[PDB]
Design a protein around this ligand. Structure first.
Ligand SMILES: *CC(=O)N1CCN(S(=O)(=O)c2ccc(Cl)cc2)CC1
Ligand SMILES: *CC(=O)N1CCN(S(=O)(=O)c2ccc(Cl)cc2)CC1
Lengths: 304, 304
């Protein structure tokens, strides 16, 4: 028993982190096979970052300007290209620690582990979700750019995030590993406001299922609702609309607990309308929305 | 910016996890040099666990009864001994992935990373604290015993916990790596109630400092207090008494923010007396107490 915000073991990703320096800018790179992936703003002088022309800036850069260090050993750069907002640095040596991997572009509501790094050195690991406004609520200081987000399916690391930007509101923006920003964000020091941070309804319901499985049941009530009725309450509280797809995804948790999805919707409705009344659920005083149905099933069944 | 419950990178510990089987009981072991550490209850049949005599049970066990598997390769057991509540299995091969390590016995309030494992395979990593009642609030199912808690100081892993027990209240009890239980707990299926789970006052204050550093300041007030006055409020709310030692430990965070420790004590006092009034601090609706002053400084300054 017990339910914790759990990151994937970070070992497979630790073995991929390198330091990239171009000029004075030092940040992190991801070394997979003979390619080092890093944010393209590594070529910027913070002055550039006001309105950088990346193609023009890159013209002034040679293979030998990209200083790539894996632990205490330098990698030889034999090629460089720009793909969207990342640089791909071809090195003469395949990373011998390259795990089985994929690049996936995640959807909002999907969760992932971040390995926060500085100078290509891992400092910590935490669990995030891609917010409905395509920001993440991370922990990133200067030097952390090029830190990656990932899921592991047994032996296969799916990389879904590279850290690029902090917004003046202290939330985080980044790319998938093809260098396309999540959401409308750009690698430029400009006025970029996040949209509404809506709550991931299906994740809240998953975590309510986790709570029941783990003994926290005080919030279960005698009520049910409909998708359309529940969704009027969701709209009012800046929750994502709940779809039949979400209901279907919660099927396994429904089955295991014997609580119909719409009954748990009715529990969530009363919690939204009535608040927690100073009580907690799985040690939280708010409704947690950074566990997916898949995360709950994984943790509650002990998959490795 | 941003402040997250952050685990240490788990790679160095992943390389130490093995599977230990004695009879039908499978759980995890920690392979350091040529020794495998695991809970002694691995020799029990759950029936035994009602009132096991471990010395007597162990007499019936030989080196060849301890099946030790590191990934898909079997380790040869050439010795076994009992130290307190752990077994030490001598194997004929030093773990080639053995990191620099220490065994430390932590104090209540101190935090650490758990690498939850099943069949010697890492499933996830999360941050814990040793509670003032010597329990931890973990996420552990059957097969997770022998999972370890740890801190990393650069290259040195300090192992502080091995998982042994869940209490009927769904909290967790375990040993340091010399096999001595934290608190009064015993590896026996009996009536074992946790004491008061008091809040780690110094950790709450550290996290209030983290909040101010990261932009969350609404809770700062025009008040100060004294240690003795604050402590009357702590007693009333089942908070640990705050000592001059705690004040001194918070010195660096005090310095950096320019908020005197006793002023922040006065902020915490009003929060205890008045509640959050439906507001949040660093995305929490309650006062977080599983960040040490050392954790806050580490995360806020980007140590690797
Ligand atoms: C995003 C990231 O981690 N980095 C981009 C900014 N650089 S930097 O070298 O321009 C720099 C800016 C500000 C400070 Cl305080 C220090 C460095 C660092 C890498
Ligand atoms: C603590 C731990 O992880 N383990 C001790 C109990 N054993 S077991 O083999 O006795 C066992 C008990 C109950 C179930 Cl459902 C399955 C196994 C497992 C390891």
């Amino acid at each position: 028993s017990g339910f914790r915000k759990m990151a994937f073991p970070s070992g497979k990703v630790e073995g991929c982190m390198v330091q990239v320096t171009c000029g004075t800018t030092t940040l992190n790179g991801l070394w997979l096979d003979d390619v080092v992936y890093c944010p393209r703003h590594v070529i910027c002088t913070s002055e550039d970052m006001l309105n950088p022309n990346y193609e023009d800036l890159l013209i002034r850069k040679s293979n030998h300007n990209f200083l790539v260090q894996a632990g205490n050993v330098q990698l030889r750069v034999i090629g460089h290209s720009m793909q969207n907002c990342v640089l791909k640095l071809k090195v003469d040596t395949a990373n011998p620690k390259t795990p089985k991997y994929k690049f996936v572009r995640i959807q909002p509501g999907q969760t992932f582990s971040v390995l926060a790094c500085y100078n290509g050195s891992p400092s910590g690991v935490y669990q995030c979700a891609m917010r409905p406004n395509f920001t993440i609520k991370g922990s990133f200081l200067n030097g952390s750019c090029g830190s990656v987000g990932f899921n592991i399916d047994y032996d296969c690391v799916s990389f879904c995030y590279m850290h690029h930007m902090e917004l003046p509101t202290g939330v985080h923006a980044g790319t998938d590993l093809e260098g396309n920003f999540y959401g409308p964000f750009v690698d430029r020091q400009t006025a970029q406001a996040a949209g509404t941070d809506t709550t991931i309804t299906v994740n809240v319901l998953a975590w309510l299922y986790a709570a029941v499985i783990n003994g926290d049941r005080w919030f279960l009530n005698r009520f049910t609702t409909t998708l359309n009725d529940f969704n009027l309450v969701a709209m009012k509280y800046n929750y994502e609309p709940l779809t039949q797809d979400h209901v279907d995804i919660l099927g396994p948790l429904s089955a295991q607990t014997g609580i119909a999805v719409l009954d748990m919707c009715a529990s969530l409705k009363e919690l939204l309308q009535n608040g927690m009344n100073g009580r907690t659920i799985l040690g939280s005083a708010l409704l947690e929305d950074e566990f997916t149905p898949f995360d709950v099933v994984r943790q509650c069944s002990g998959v490795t």
